[PDB]
Amino acid sequence: MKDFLKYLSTAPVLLTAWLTFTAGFVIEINRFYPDALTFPF
Amino acid sequence: DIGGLNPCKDSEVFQKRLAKTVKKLENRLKKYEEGTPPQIAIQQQITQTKQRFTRYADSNLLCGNDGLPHLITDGRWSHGSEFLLPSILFLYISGWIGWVGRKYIRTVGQTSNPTEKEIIIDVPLAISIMTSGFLWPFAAWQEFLSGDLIASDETITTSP
Amino acid sequence: EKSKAVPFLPRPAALDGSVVGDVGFDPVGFTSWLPLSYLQEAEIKHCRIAMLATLGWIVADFVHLPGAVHEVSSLAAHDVAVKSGALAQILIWTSIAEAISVIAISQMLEGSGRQPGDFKFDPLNFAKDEKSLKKMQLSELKNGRLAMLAFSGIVTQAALTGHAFPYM
Amino acid sequence: KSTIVDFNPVETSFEKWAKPGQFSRTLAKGPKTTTWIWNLHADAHDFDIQTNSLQEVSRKIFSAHFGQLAVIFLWLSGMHFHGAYFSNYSAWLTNPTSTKPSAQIVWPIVGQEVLNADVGGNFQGIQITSGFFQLWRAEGITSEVELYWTAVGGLVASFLMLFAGWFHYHKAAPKLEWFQNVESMLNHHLAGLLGLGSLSWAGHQIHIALPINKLLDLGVSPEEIPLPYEFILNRDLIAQLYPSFNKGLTPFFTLNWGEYSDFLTFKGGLNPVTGGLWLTDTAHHHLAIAVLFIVAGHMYKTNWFLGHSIKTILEAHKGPFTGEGHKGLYEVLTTSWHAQLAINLALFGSLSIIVAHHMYAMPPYPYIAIDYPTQLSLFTHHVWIGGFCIVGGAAHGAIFFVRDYNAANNYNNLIDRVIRHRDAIISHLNWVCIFLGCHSFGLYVHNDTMRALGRSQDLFSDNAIALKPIFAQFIQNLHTLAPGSTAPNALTTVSYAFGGDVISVGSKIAMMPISLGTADFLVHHIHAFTIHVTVLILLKGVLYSRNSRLIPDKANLGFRFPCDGPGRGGTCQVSAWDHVFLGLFWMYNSISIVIFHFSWKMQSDVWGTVSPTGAVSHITGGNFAQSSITINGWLRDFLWSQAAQVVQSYGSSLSAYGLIFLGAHFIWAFSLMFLFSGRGYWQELIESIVWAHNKLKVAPSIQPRALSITQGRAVGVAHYLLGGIGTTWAFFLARIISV
Amino acid sequence: SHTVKIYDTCIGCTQCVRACPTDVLEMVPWDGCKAGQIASAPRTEDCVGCKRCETACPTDFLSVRVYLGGETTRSLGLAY
Amino acid sequence: KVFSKSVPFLLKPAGLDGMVGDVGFDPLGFATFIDIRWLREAELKNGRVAMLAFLGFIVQEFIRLPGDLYSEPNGVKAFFQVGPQPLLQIFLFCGFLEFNMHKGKLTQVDMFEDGKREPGNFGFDPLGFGKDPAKRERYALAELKNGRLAMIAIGGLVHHALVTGHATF
Ligand code: CLA
Ligand code: CLA
Numbered sequence A: 001m002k003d004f005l006k007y008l009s010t011a012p013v014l015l016t017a018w019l020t021f022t023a024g025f026v027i028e029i030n031r032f033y034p035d036a037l038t039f040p041f
Numbered sequence B: 001d002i003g004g005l006n007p008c009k010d011s012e013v014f015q016k017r018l019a020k021t022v023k024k025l026e027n028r029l030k031k032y033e034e035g036t037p038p039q040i041a042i043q044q045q046i047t048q049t050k051q052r053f054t055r056y057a058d059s060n061l062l063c064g065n066d067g068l069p070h071l072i073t074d075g076r077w078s079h080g081s082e083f084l085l086p087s088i089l090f091l092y093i094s095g096w097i098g099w100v101g102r103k104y105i106r107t108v109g110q111t112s113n114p115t116e117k118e119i120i121i122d123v124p125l126a127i128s129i130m131t132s133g134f135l136w137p138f139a140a141w142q143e144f145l146s147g148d149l150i151a152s153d154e155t156i157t158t159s160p
Numbered sequence C: 001e002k003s004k005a006v007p008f009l010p011r012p013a014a015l016d017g018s019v020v021g022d023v024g025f026d027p028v029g030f031t032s033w034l035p036l037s038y039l040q041e042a043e044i045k046h047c048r049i050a051m052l053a054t055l056g057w058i059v060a061d062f063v064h065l066p067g068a069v070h071e072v073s074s075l076a077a078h079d080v081a082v083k084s085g086a087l088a089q090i091l092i093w094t095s096i097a098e099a100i101s102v103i104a105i106s107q108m109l110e111g112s113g114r115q116p117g118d119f120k121f122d123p124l125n126f127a128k129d130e131k132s133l134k135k136m137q138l139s140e141l142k143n144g145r146l147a148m149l150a151f152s153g154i155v156t157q158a159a160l161t162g163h164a165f166p167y168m
Numbered sequence D: 001k002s003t004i005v006d007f008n009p010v011e012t013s014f015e016k017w018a019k020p021g022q023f024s025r026t027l028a029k030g031p032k033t034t035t036w037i038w039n040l041h042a043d044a045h046d047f048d049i050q051t052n053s054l055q056e057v058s059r060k061i062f063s064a065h066f067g068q069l070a071v072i073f074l075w076l077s078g079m080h081f082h083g084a085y086f087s088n089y090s091a092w093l094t095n096p097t098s099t100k101p102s103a104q105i106v107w108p109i110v111g112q113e114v115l116n117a118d119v120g121g122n123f124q125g126i127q128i129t130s131g132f133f134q135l136w137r138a139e140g141i142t143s144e145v146e147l148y149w150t151a152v153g154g155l156v157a158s159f160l161m162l163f164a165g166w167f168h169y170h171k172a173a174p175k176l177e178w179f180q181n182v183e184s185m186l187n188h189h190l191a192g193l194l195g196l197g198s199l200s201w202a203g204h205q206i207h208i209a210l211p212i213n214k215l216l217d218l219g220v221s222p223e224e225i226p227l228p229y230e231f232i233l234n235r236d237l238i239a240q241l242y243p244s245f246n247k248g249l250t251p252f253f254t255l256n257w258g259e260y261s262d263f264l265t266f267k268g269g270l271n272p273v274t275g276g277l278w279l280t281d282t283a284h285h286h287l288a289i290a291v292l293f294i295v296a297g298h299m300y301k302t303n304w305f306l307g308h309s310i311k312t313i314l315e316a317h318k319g320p321f322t323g324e325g326h327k328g329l330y331e332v333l334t335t336s337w338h339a340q341l342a343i344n345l346a347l348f349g350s351l352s353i354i355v356a357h358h359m360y361a362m363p364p365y366p367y368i369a370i371d372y373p374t375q376l377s378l379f380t381h382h383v384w385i386g387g388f389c390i391v392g393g394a395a396h397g398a399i400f401f402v403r404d405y406n407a408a409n410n411y412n413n414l415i416d417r418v419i420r421h422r423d424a425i426i427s428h429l430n431w432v433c434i435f436l437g438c439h440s441f442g443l444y445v446h447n448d449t450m451r452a453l454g455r456s457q458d459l460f461s462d463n464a465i466a467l468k469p470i471f472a473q474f475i476q477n478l479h480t481l482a483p484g485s486t487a488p489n490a491l492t493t494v495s496y497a498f499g500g501d502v503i504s505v506g507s508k509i510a511m512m513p514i515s516l517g518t519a520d521f522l523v524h525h526i527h528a529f530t531i532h533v534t535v536l537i538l539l540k541g542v543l544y545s546r547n548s549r550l551i552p553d554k555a556n557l558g559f560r561f562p563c564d565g566p567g568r569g570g571t572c573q574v575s576a577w578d579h580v581f582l583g584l585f586w587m588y589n590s591i592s593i594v595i596f597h598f599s600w601k602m603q604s605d606v607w608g609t610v611s612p613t614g615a616v617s618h619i620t621g622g623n624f625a626q627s628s629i630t631i632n633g634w635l636r637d638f639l640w641s642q643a644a645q646v647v648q649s650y651g652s653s654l655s656a657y658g659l660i661f662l663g664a665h666f667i668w669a670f671s672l673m674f675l676f677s678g679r680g681y682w683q684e685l686i687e688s689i690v691w692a693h694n695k696l697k698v699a700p701s702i703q704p705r706a707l708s709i710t711q712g713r714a715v716g717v718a719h720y721l722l723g724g725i726g727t728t729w730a731f732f733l734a735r736i737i738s739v
Numbered sequence E: 001s002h003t004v005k006i007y008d009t010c011i012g013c014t015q016c017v018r019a020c021p022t023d024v025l026e027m028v029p030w031d032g033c034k035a036g037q038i039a040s041a042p043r044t045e046d047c048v049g050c051k052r053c054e055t056a057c058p059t060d061f062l063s064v065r066v067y068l069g070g071e072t073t074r075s076l077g078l079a080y
Numbered sequence F: 001k002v003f004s005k006s007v008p009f010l011l012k013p014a015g016l017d018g019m020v021g022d023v024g025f026d027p028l029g030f031a032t033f034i035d036i037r038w039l040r041e042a043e044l045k046n047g048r049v050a051m052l053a054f055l056g057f058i059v060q061e062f063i064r065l066p067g068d069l070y071s072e073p074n075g076v077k078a079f080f081q082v083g084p085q086p087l088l089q090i091f092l093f094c095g096f097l098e099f100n101m102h103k104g105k106l107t108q109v110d111m112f113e114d115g116k117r118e119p120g121n122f123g124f125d126p127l128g129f130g131k132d133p134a135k136r137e138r139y140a141l142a143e144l145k146n147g148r149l150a151m152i153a154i155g156g157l158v159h160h161a162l163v164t165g166h167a168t169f
């Protein structure tokens, strides 16, 4: 698991993981607080 | 008020839009049976539509002659939650991203194989830099003061 | 040559004698393309899981925890426990244990020296020297295989015929 | 130490996963510019340049095939799982003519739940145009549990294919001699794969699909239909529907095959209940195909003194006009993967197009002819796949000519003689293309300008100068007369498209005689012209891939290169790749015209509803005959008219089709940036951007470079194809689902 | 005919001469570099303008430069 | 091989040697790809914050302040009733403290760049407990253990208030 972790450190895998996480928290914010046109405050 | 607009809480066309959307959703709801998942989904749609319209009405939002919320982005703090606060939020987040990217580029740029560490990210160092971007406004106005933010004449130029 | 278990089959060539519960039983040669330590760890994990599962199935069809949710047969207990969140806690703690297991099996495969299935969990002794440890390892392996087959039979019979503890 | 395989050739390790570009000698040193990243993916599957041994390339290809089949099995498992869990298949079974097939539900986020349409059967979801419901019904699948088990089997099969690929690359890789047993491979693929697959499917149809579908058509609900295994254990559940199983297999072994006429029929036409082909006819067809393919598999000599040698067959086919004939072709096709890929891809795309035609022509599934979205989608998809595969076959023929072609081994054979007179071929094909384009399109333009000038009697129309496709009408007449005259054991024509009665299921037309007039003449000649121009581009690429009068050493520049320079007046796109690029464009044009012709002709002169008294009213109303003869007619009565549903889809459950319409327009227009521009401008703009980055100390170590000329062309053509095909996709789907 | 010029940044690596498809360039004696040789363009009437010569040039901004000019049946690569 | 003392079936983790809480507990090896000094600083700060927050729960449900705003025995509901104005002042005060206690260097890459900074050592000791070095190690270990226990307990109390809603009691 020394080269597998290095493989997971490559640009495509890291970008895919980061974009999946990013889309995930964006989608979940929009699920829990939907239809947010202005700042909540 | 501003620009001839009126608050959406007193806009008749806004309430007409809400009523028409709710009526369409209820007509769609009529063609399903009992407490079946389709009816539950349509009822959730109706509830969310009503909640969204109510929130937009009670939001200091100005509606035009079409009954749609118009954004007042001239800079006034009265409508500051429409553009100014999201503007500050995005500026913070994007400055964070740019700062951590620049810091990672400059950090692995002083190693033996700078190009290797760009396709194969040093995840420990990347995590170290990324969580340090919360001070990007302060770090930027501490590196610009020291002259470490801008190159001067080592930058390359074309022939003319 | 001529493995002990199947006397007309050749020895699996990866199980000579130096493993507990090694009667040379690998006709389809699973050990010829998989690490022996990995397979041993998987077998011991299955043995322990199925022993706990057989005991729990049999006991829960007799004794129930207080509460209306715990008043179902073990065959129908999965859909009730998952809804109540009872299996969620087991899943969480089993996942923690299995992540630590990921680390442990990786270290064992890459050197270390940890025997397959050896978590050093031994509050009491029950195994003082090498001979006692080998005998108890053989007992654990045999009991685990028996319990795996027993749980298989119990589940298949209970699903076929929705009977109580006697699943005949 | 087997004689066919090598044991443990490559170690299973993750070390090379952490070294991108390890396969290439040039990319292994690591990236220095952003061109390395693009070169990494462009050379990933180019196994010819990664190893110098044909054995290693063959082993890599074999394992890649296993990975592809695992991916296909995973896709099929996903389809079956969606049918089992997120579909209204059970509701559609009880009401095939009034419930729209849906097998994908959409989560309620950001307001996207509007996409869950009213498909019927107390269900909300996206209407499915892949025809899986009809296929599953034809398979006898009457429950979603069977779909779940098929999905589980698909997952298991996908894992098995993954394991097979790993095994045959890392544990037991076959040798070159094993791969070069083309006689044995052909024998097995013809007998085992094809024939035994047809035989097994005939068995399944006869024992499962024939009784279950007969009960379904009789009105028996799926819940009271016996489970499929009961039709095998009980010879009385199937002997009531087909009273010939009571005799068992004795008629088969006693050559009294006439007894099996109950379930092995030859009827033709369509089932009046479902609108599809008679499943007894389908079972008989698969049985005959199985026998024919099994017989055909005993042709080539493999391991006994029996069969043919393909080398001896080819070498004996010489002639006065062809010199050495087919001598050396066996060596070409047993030492070059690219030649095999060319032949297989060309014939595979042609087969896909033939499949697309025969699908709608003779609907083979129950209640699929009346599902117009399914028919349109299946035809368009299969024709698109066929065109792409044909262009790929041409590309790999060019690749073989550049790389694997040996001049010494092909002295005076067919390949040599074709290259020796490539000029004549290309010049005459050029003349034919000009003739066909001039005629077809200029007849269209003449019709347009005569209509614009108020001279309606000067058009190339039916009520004007008429170009009747007499040859095709003669064939149509011959087929409708075949039952009883040339096919005396047929009860009905193969397809009602050639003529006959209007077949309607639930007041919806399934099939109907497709009349051919002057409008079909013009569009058929347009098809011929576009196909000829695509062939011209691809054949010019293949023949001039090695040398020309411009560049006498074009083979030394490789298959993929941008140019030879601005000299000779300009030597852009002289490659053979740049011909597969232009040919891709022209294939897009041809296939777009083909699918437009299909959509308009079907909607205007086949599909529609039938009144109880027998009056046929079509979707558009027969406007194809008189308004498809001018370009303004195509623009207005087809594009503008049938685009109404796409543009008015906002706020409805088809709004996703409008969004994809707009996005595909955007992507198609985006392509033109890469297609029209050049690399130097973008490199010099990146220069100033890099200056800004250096000024802010954020210039990347991997130097950013503009996409190479060939990659710029590839990006342009890929975006162009995606945008155009997506625009047509959204247009077709929204139009044919709305109406 | 096109114009081909050689500049004293030439290192005499001969890659231009062995890349010319029409035998325009040749190596001639020189004393301005280690190799003691410099490229020459004595047959520019055969120059086709393909610029293979300067694709093989290793010097920083080239030592052989091709300036496209008047066209000829030789420079246009016309076999007809 | 040494094997860890806490997790006896795992190899001894690296980078924990000279620490005041070393029991060899690092199965995931977080100390290998994260600076151990930063990890100890973060552990100590999280522990101290959790201890203060647990004490805050227990006092809030018991004592509370006079006023309509400060009248919720439930900490989770008190977070909402108190309004944003009192909370934002706490946020800004904590930020001021963070800035002045670390003297500018606040980030993972900036802190411990020059060394000479014992993890968690702010020099805060007005009452003088810790002059004797003999009990200093015991006090450090006690602080670490109490901080970890308080992290677990702070999570427990917060989630009890969420699933029940009344209080901790
Ligand atoms: C494979 C292991 C396993 C699994 C998945 C289950 C699962 C289940 N059991 Mg169960 N059980 C088990 C073993 C298991 N049991 C054993 C070994 C016994 C004998 C003591 C019991 C005795 C038992 C009773 C008496 C009852 C259940 C019940 C139930 C159901 C709901 C409540 C619950 O989780 O049990 C609660 C479990 C217990 C109270 C005793 C568990 C004792 C454990 C298994 C032994 C110690 C092992 C140790 C903690 C392992 C550490 C894990 C590590 C990752 C940290 C649920 C389907 C209830 C039910 O609804 O019946 C239908 C019920 O009334 N079980
Ligand atoms: C009757 C025997 C038989 C059968 C059924 C097949 C079937 C197949 N061969 Mg194959 N082959 C055979 C004999 C056979 N071959 C012999 C004797 C040789 C030596 C000359 C080869 C050499 C060969 C090569 C070099 C390649 C194939 C490929 C293929 C696949 C073509 C893809 C396709 O149509 O998808 C249809 C897919 C299916 C119907 C899925 C089910 C098929 C499963 C996997 C059964 C496969 C039968 C297998 C030979 C049994 C061996 C089991 C093993 C334990 C010994 C297909 C699965 C190509 C391929 O895709 O590679 C993987 C390929 O590149 N074959």
Ligand code: CLA
Pocket (backbone or CB within 6 Å): D041, D042, D043, D044, D045, D046, D047, D345, D388, D389, D390, D391, D392, D393, D395, D399, D559, D560, D577, D580, D581, D584, D718, D722
């Ligand atoms: C059985 C089918 C098959 C097979 C095995 C191959 C195999 C090969 N081809 Mg080939 N080809 C095929 C079909 C096939 N092709 C078809 C149908 C065409 C016509 C378009 C071509 C056109 C073609 C050209 C023009 C070239 C090849 C080349 C190659 C070789 C290298 C491929 C490579 O590294 O790409 C690696 C894979 C990629 C780079 C993937 C690129 C991504 C694609 C372009 C976009 C796909 C988008 C997708 C549909 C999703 C879009 C949806 C959107 C919403 C996101 C390899 C031998 C090249 C070569 O040098 O051969 C020696 C070469 O120059 N082929």
Ligand code: CLA
Pocket (backbone or CB within 6 Å): D429, D430, D431, D433, D434, D435, D436, D437, D438, D441, D442, D445, D533, D536, D537, D582, D583, D585, D586
């Ligand atoms: C609408 C745009 C358009 C048109 C009209 C054409 C036309 C043609 N292309 Mg094409 N092409 C196009 C777009 C178009 N292309 C695009 C976008 C691409 C990029 C991929 C290509 C790429 C391409 C390639 C790669 C090739 C062609 C070829 C051809 C020719 C096929 C032979 C033929 O039919 O000639 C007949 C001419 C026509 C049908 C045009 C209309 C002529 C009218 C109807 C009749 C005559 C009118 C009369 C003379 C007017 C006189 C009056 C006037 C003096 C005032 C033809 C000239 C092939 C070729 O060279 O020819 C064999 C070929 O190899 N094209």
Ligand SMILES: CC(/C=C/C=C(C)/C=C/[C@@]12O[C@]1(C)C[C@@H](O)CC2(C)C)=C\C=C\C=C(C)\C=C\C=C(C)\C=C\[C@@]12O[C@]1(C)C[C@@H](O)CC2(C)C
Pocket (backbone or CB within 6 Å): C084, C085, C086, C088, C089, C092, F144, F145, F146, F148, F149, F152, F163
């Ligand atoms: C207690 C605990 C850990 C305790 C460990 C302790 C104290 C000891 C710590 C120390 O010794 C060490 C280790 C090392 C020393 O150097 C430090 C000290 C401090 C000395 C974890 C709890 C962990 C507690 C957990 C994980 C609880 C999870 C609960 C869940 C998921 C509940 C879910 C539901 O309630 C919902 C959400 C909805 C309901 O309807 C359904 C259900 C399912 C019931």
Ligand SMILES: CC(/C=C/C=C(C)/C=C/[C@@]12O[C@]1(C)C[C@@H](O)CC2(C)C)=C\C=C\C=C(C)\C=C\C=C(C)\C=C\[C@@]12O[C@]1(C)C[C@@H](O)CC2(C)C
Pocket (backbone or CB within 6 Å): C096, F075, F076, F079, F151, F152, F154, F155, F156, F158
């Ligand atoms: C799960 C958890 C700890 C889990 C610990 C585990 C499993 C430990 C296991 C072990 O110890 C054992 C068992 C034995 C050891 O030998 C080994 C290990 C393995 C080490 C802590 C959660 C800890 C969770 C915490 C601390 C959460 C705190 C939440 C807060 C403060 C929320 C505040 C808000 O919610 C309000 C109040 C209002 C909202 O609207 C706004 C916000 C601000 C979001």
Ligand SMILES: CC1=C(C/C=C(\C)CCC[C@H](C)CCC[C@H](C)CCCC(C)C)C(=O)c2ccccc2C1=O
Pocket (backbone or CB within 6 Å): D673, D674, D675, D677, D678, D679, D682, D705, D706, D707, D708, D709, D711, D712, D713
């Ligand atoms: C813009 C342009 C460039 C510059 C284009 C570059 C440098 C491509 C940059 C791609 C970025 C860096 C990655 C892709 C980012 C996308 C957002 C990802 C694709 C979207 C996914 C959904 C697939 C050329 O190099 C070029 C070369 C030859 C002819 C025309 C052109 C040309 O038009």
Ligand code: SF4
Pocket (backbone or CB within 6 Å): D562, D563, D564, D565, D566, D570, D571, D572, D573, D678, D709
């Ligand atoms: S760059 Fe474009 S134009 Fe200049 S030569 Fe290469 S291809 Fe022809």
